């Protein structure tokens with residue numbers, strides 16, 4: 009038997025379009041879907057089912073294989089909630105491991121009355137063929153109800169390995185598992201496999217996660233421009249630290265001197281910059297997460313492969329702030345850098361508050377929508393919007409480690 | 411007799427009831443024909459006379475088919491349709507000739523009455539009940555219900571399409587070297603089989619379709635090549651674009667010119683040389699679609715040129731997966747681009763052109779990036795992959811731009827093709843303040859209510875100026891200031907301002923704008939040898 013799962017009150021099922029798929033990706037998904045059909049996992053469905061959810065093909069590790077990635081983001085939002093907490097020790101361990109457990113859902117039937125909602129389509133090159141319509145019979149991998157129904161069942165399978173050593177913290181987010189152990193490299197991986205092997209019947213260290221502060225440019229010689237820069241940025245920063253002053257600096261500016269002239273900083277203007285640096289020396293007090301609020305995360309392309317982000321909920325009240333430097337491979341590709349960054353950030357989020365943030369991406373919707381799945385790795389998919397990076401928000405965070 | 415297949419389960423738009431209306435009274439002439447028909451169908455097992463327990467009803471109509479000249483039946487399902495469940499209908503994914511792989515031969519099967527060849531979900535049948543009216547309402551109307559997919563009903567194309575799919579399931583499996591494209595009432599079936607082996611296989615599907623309840627299309631209504639498939643003629647080795655003609659007259663109305671213009675714009679895709687500046691000009695200040703307009707001399711000319719160009723034979727080769735997919739792009743003017751995808755040189759699979767949208771602001775590299783990728787998407791749709799691009803831009807320039815452009819951006823694998831004019835950065839603001847050059851401290855202001863604007867400058871070199879402006883916006887003066895800075899400065903300038911828009915330009919370095927002031931400013935910018943736009947916060951006086 010299976011638990012009845014319904015959509016939230018007053019919601020209809022997902023009717024999303026399937027964006028175009030690369031030939032290599034279609035072929036694969038068909039191959040993938042045939043086996044599941046045989047295995048009774050998905051069932052071809054007709055035109056009486058007006059729903060739809062998108063599917064894509066991503067790539068795994070050491071098995072040059074493709075994985076069916078379904079985007080249930082919309083379905084999920086429309087899915088009833090599952091109650092009617094996050095172990096904060098995970099974000100502290102100098103080591104966590106990403107493991108997938110979504111493969112486990114196929115052994116658990118899906119309420120017949122909800123299956124139509126998991127409807128999806130495999131596209132056709134040039135549309136010389138109908139979309140191979142299917143629908144899930146079991147718990148759909150990547151769906152939110154899945155980790156939930158398989159919870160009681162995930163409690164029992166996990167229980168022994170947990171009771172083994174209450175030390176370790178394992179977090180179950182959607183289809184993944186984050187295993188925490190403070191033991192050295194070989195140590196973590198060794199106790200890691202026991203869990204994995206036990207499951208038959210990446211090594212992250214949440215410490216280097218320094219919400220890196222701001223540093224103001226020390227300078228032997230200051231020009232009008234340099235001040236203009238400095239000042240223009242302090243004024244933005246005052247939106248965060250309201251104790252940041254720019255007056256004594258601006259006095260050194262009263263005048264139409266040449267941009268390149270060297271301005272000697274008055275002693276008064278001196279203390280004010282000094283005061284400003286102190287203020288910047290630590291995060292704005294009073295910023296603490298709120299569970300009932302959506303966690304926001306916007307990213308700024310900084311150039312030279314550098315990237316900056318901030319996760320918050322209340323504007324200017326950043327819960328964390330960081331930078332990204334393209335992985336030695338992402339070079340001529342911002343899309344790869346942007347994907348990696350998004351995924352990096354998203355995991356950091358989960359590990360800390362157990363939810364993915366909503367991204368504000370400095371990319372054109374159309375450029376993102378076309379190539380992101382070619383570099384995507386995560387079994388889950390964040391919410392995302394597209395924006396136009398305001399000129400100073402970037403510059404402010406440009407003031408990093410340099 | 412019809413198909414013994416599983417009926418798709420239909421439900422009325424989740425939450426309503428079947429339609430019902432007083433049957434539009436018809437003449438005895440019509441009514442008569444209507445009975446003949448309905449009885450024929452009744453025996454073919456298509457519709458069924460029924461009992462007075464049916465609260466539902468749809469209007470039947472007899473239209474003199476302006477083809478065979480006899481009375482035909484037509485049921486008006488507008489109401490039933492506006493209460494039938496929505497079905498999966500993404501079939502608006504019409505192949506493009508360019509993506510079809512060449513086939514040794516194609517054969518087109520007719521399966522027209524097939525909607526009538528597929529049964530209707532017994533539960534839903536009731537709602538389709540229609541009635542044949544009686545002479546002056548004498549012997550109450552003959553009552554019928556549909557047993558099969560009624561033509562004109564919402565779910566038929568979908569259901570019929572899926573049914574056909576289930577039935578082809580077997581065949582295709584058995585012979586995975588026979589391509590079948592299902593479109594409306596035809597099955598375009600082709601192969602690379604020897605014409606005799608192909609001819610046998612088609613015959614086979616036919617005896618299979620018959621096996622399945624779909625009757626065979628008599629050798630009178632047999633469609634043969636070239637295939638006239640909307641917009642094109644599909645010949646065996648090539649596909650052509652159906653010639654578009656311009657309806658000439660000596661009196662053109664608004665409506666006329668608009669339709670023309672719309673038709674000429676369409677032609678602009680396969681014909682990058684179609685112009686409509688003059689023709690479109692004839693729209694200025696019109697007064698009614700019925701209004702008659704005389705073409706300018708230039709318009710008459712333009713029309714003339716377009717006629718000739720439209721004569722030149724347009725077509726393309728088909729898809730050979732064994733060869734590269736190449737795409738070349740040219741900029742035919744600011745904000746207009748041409749591409750032509752082909753596997754073999756000259757053998758264009760397809761060509762086309764993109765346009766601008768008077769972008770409030772962009773550079774041509776961005777615009778080039780948008781065209782490339784737009785192409786990329788249609789290439790993926792048509793051929794399941796992306797073309798090796800051959801773009802009119804120096805890689806040096808490309809590397810240079812994308813490096814620091816604030817927005818994420820990329821061009822897939824591409825190579826450089828020196829087919830002028832090349833795409834470049836019209837200007838580049840200097841990275842640091844310019845040593846030596848004058849420094850323009852600009853400022854603009856305006857009383858938003860009065861529009862009495864004021865904008866000026868003060869240079870470190872004593873030079874200064876202030877211009878009076880009436881009917882200007884805060885924004886205008888702000889920019890005008892910068893514009894004055896530029897009109898009056900040497901080959902190198904430093905300009906400081908508080909304008910948030912100026913800053914919005916420092917980041918983007920646009921060269922196309924919505925605002926002409928900003929377009930004129932872009933002018934001054936490209937003229938200069940060195941330009942350094944620096945920004946500082948307003949409401950605090952520096953000059």
Ligand SMILES: CC(C)c1c(Cc2ccccc2)n(COCc2ccccc2)c(=O)[nH]c1=O
Pocket residue numbers: 136505510511512513514515516589590591598599600635636637639644645646647728
């Ligand atoms: C069977 C279909 C999918 C198909 C076709 C027909 C076709 C006709 C209309 C709409 C779509 C397809 N052609 C069109 O080629 C025209 C043609 C005419 C005569 C002989 C061979 C080919 C082709 O080149 N390859 C194909 O695979």
